[PDB]
Amino acid sequence: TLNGGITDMLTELANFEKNVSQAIHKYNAYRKAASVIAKYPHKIKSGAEAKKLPGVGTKIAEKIDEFLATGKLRKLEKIRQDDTSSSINFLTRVSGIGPSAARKFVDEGIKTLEDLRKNEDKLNHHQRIGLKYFGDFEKRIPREEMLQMQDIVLNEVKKVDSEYIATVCGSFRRGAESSGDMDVLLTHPSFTSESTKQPKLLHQVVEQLQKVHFITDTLSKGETKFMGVCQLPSKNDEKEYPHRRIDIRLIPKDQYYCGVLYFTGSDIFNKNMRAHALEKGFTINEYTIRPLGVTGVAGEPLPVDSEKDIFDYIQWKYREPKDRSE
DNA sequence: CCGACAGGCGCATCAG
DNA sequence: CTGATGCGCC
DNA sequence: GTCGG
Ligand SMILES: Cc1cn([C@H]2C[C@H](O)[C@@H](COP(=O)(O)OP(=O)(O)OP(=O)(O)O)O2)c(=O)[nH]c1=O
Ligand SMILES: [Ca+2]
Ligand SMILES: [Ca+2]
Ligand SMILES: [Ca+2]
Ligand SMILES: [Ca+2]
Ligand SMILES: [Ca+2]
């Protein structure tokens, strides 16, 4: 809210660049400026003042002056009138339609939800499901429901095997009062970086959640990652709960801390933290943190005993999950 | 002034 | 069929 | 679009 007009404008420009221009680095640079501006605890009074922040440059600062003097941005006002742009942006809101497929559909005359519904034969499976649940998936999930979903998944996981650990991550672990979707990190002692002693580890969890009707559809599913759809049970004479997006990630149990750091996010925080690690001569993924030698070649995995360890290597003070938001 | 911009899973498709 | 590439997603 | 070497 504090600089909400500025950060909205930048986010809309970041969406344009991603969805229409297909310029991912301009997308990320707009999101970086938005983010830095959103954490800045003063009402921004001029572009030159925003320019002082990291990630705000000449061009964003010029935009901020226009937005502050007039309350709008001519560049955006054009984009909002351009039918093609608006159509491509709209279509990418369906889960599974990205910038490329949206452009392709729009060239073929497919411009509306109505158009999508009467051409589902042209959609892959993921897209079919994102169309079927189009409105449900743009709804947020109150924490109260996240808590009941957590209770279902943890209990069903335990029925399959008491040694599974399932932790709910993303915005939920960051303490948010609502979440866009559910993210579940899964470990079992039989799957470590050194061996897989049991097959089907994730499949069995998925099967059990389909059996009790919690999971209702599958978008994609391999050996370590499941992306699908789930729904809380509703009681007599009640409206059904919306269908929700669910992601489950099986991580080797000895790499839990790298895994949970990745899966807690936010996405921007991970980009920032991983970019900072490179500046310090490390690389971080969801499995490990490793030094970067002269070559640019990644060395051997550093011992990691906690989340804070990872922060220590790159000389950052610990941030608790709830301070990793925005 | 200009490389580099986080890192990787699953899926669809293309060349051979 | 394998292996490489890019899309869409987290 | 931005920035540090
Ligand atoms: C989208 C995205 C997510 N992630 C990681 C960090 C996120 O917290 C988690 C992704 O799940 P998301 O559910 O996309 O993110 P979220 O839980 O933070 O936000 P929301 O409340 O809207 O659901 O995975 C990345 O590392 N990079 C990315 O680009
Ligand atoms: Ca700056
Ligand atoms: Ca989409
Ligand atoms: Ca989420
Ligand atoms: Ca998710
Ligand atoms: Ca139903």
Side-chain angles (χ1 to χ4, degrees), chain A residues 1-110 112-293 296-316 318-326:
Chain A
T1 304
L2 185 45
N3 290 291
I6 310 284
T7 57
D8 284 340
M9 163 196 81
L10 293 173
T11 295
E12 192 174 349
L13 288 154
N15 294 335
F16 173 77
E17 293 299 344
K18 178 174 172 270
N19 300 330
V20 180
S21 318
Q22 314 173 249
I24 198 72
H25 296 133
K26 303 187 175 211
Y27 164 72
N28 277 324
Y30 279 125
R31 284 203 312 168
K32 185 190 203 154
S35 185
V36 74
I37 285 157
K39 291 180 218 223
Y40 182 67
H42 308 272
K43 174 124 161 269
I44 281 162
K45 288 166 181 63
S46 86
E49 175 195 4
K51 175 108 184 187
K52 300 205 165 134
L53 302 173
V56 191
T58 271
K59 276 149 157 290
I60 284 175
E62 266 167 16
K63 281 161 163 90
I64 290 173
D65 283 319
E66 180 179 349
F67 181 82
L68 289 165
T70 80
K72 55 184 60 188
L73 191 69
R74 281 166 292 159
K75 176 175 172 60
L76 277 178
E77 300 321 311
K78 307 245 178 200
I79 292 158
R80 294 171 181 195
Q81 280 183 306
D82 176 298
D83 286 317
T84 281
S85 297
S86 280
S87 281
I88 286 165
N89 260 333
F90 176 61
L91 289 197
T92 63
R93 286 170 45 196
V94 174
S95 190
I97 305 190
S100 168
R103 179 165 297 271
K104 205 178 189 302
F105 290 131
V106 167
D107 289 344
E108 290 159 17
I110 301 157
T112 69
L113 216 40
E114 229 61 282
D115 294 346
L116 283 186
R117 277 152 179 171
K118 68 173 279 181
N119 288 276
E120 60 189 347
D121 63 284
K122 275 191 134 185
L123 299 177
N124 73 35
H125 174 71
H126 186 323
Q127 297 167 341
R128 263 211 189 212
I129 302 311
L131 172 63
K132 183 188 193 198
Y133 297 115
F134 178 77
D136 280 2
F137 286 175
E138 295 218 314
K139 297 179 190 196
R140 304 198 57 88
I141 306 171
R143 199 180 175 82
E144 190 192 350
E145 291 178 42
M146 287 293 288
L147 286 169
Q148 311 170 234
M149 295 161 77
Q150 179 183 238
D151 187 72
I152 296 184
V153 170
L154 271 54
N155 278 301
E156 296 308 325
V157 147
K158 173 138 100 243
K159 292 168 196 179
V160 179
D161 187 340
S162 79
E163 304 203 73
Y164 278 124
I165 300 156
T167 317
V168 178
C169 304
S171 62
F172 177 85
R173 185 160 185 269
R174 306 195 304 271
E177 274 309 300
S178 77
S179 291
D181 83 356
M182 188 179 233
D183 315 287
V184 193
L185 201 176
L186 192 68
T187 65
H188 193 270
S190 292
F191 176 46
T192 69
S193 47
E194 298 310 324
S195 68
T196 302
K197 303 200 288 172
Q198 228 93 77
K200 249 100 180 199
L201 274 179
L202 175 58
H203 173 98
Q204 272 171 8
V205 163
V206 174
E207 228 199 304
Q208 177 74 43
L209 294 168
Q210 290 167 318
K211 172 160 168 194
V212 295
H213 304 111
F214 179 69
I215 288 179
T216 57
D217 303 81
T218 296
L219 294 167
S220 68
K221 182 168 171 277
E223 291 234 280
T224 71
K225 186 162 65 67
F226 171 86
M227 267 206 306
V229 181
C230 61
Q231 189 183 32
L232 285 171
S234 45
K235 294 169 188 190
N236 288 167
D237 272 17
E238 298 200 343
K239 214 199 183 197
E240 283 190 6
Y241 280 104
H243 287 78
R244 320 290 206 177
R245 274 277 295 103
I246 184 173
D247 295 322
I248 309 187
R249 190 70 193 271
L250 172 69
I251 293 288
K253 184 171 173 95
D254 61 299
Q255 295 172 160
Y256 162 79
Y257 294 112
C258 281
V260 78
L261 171 79
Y262 153 75
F263 229 21
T264 304
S266 62
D267 59 347
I268 295 158
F269 171 84
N270 292 342
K271 288 162 67 56
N272 288 157
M273 184 175 173
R274 295 164 171 208
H276 184 70
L278 293 174
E279 268 205 35
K280 296 287 187 152
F282 300 91
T283 184
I284 290 170
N285 61 21
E286 65 261 57
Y287 305 122
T288 62
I289 174 170
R290 300 172 283 176
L292 276 202
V297 173
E300 297 296 303
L302 295 168
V304 161
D305 208 345
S306 73
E307 276 191 73
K308 190 173 177 297
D309 275 15
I310 300 158
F311 284 82
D312 282 340
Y313 283 117
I314 69 165
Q315 297 166 319
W316 265 12
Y318 191 56
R319 302 227 272 261
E320 295 292 334
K322 71 191 147 284
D323 297 307
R324 302 179 205 170
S325 288
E326 295 166 282

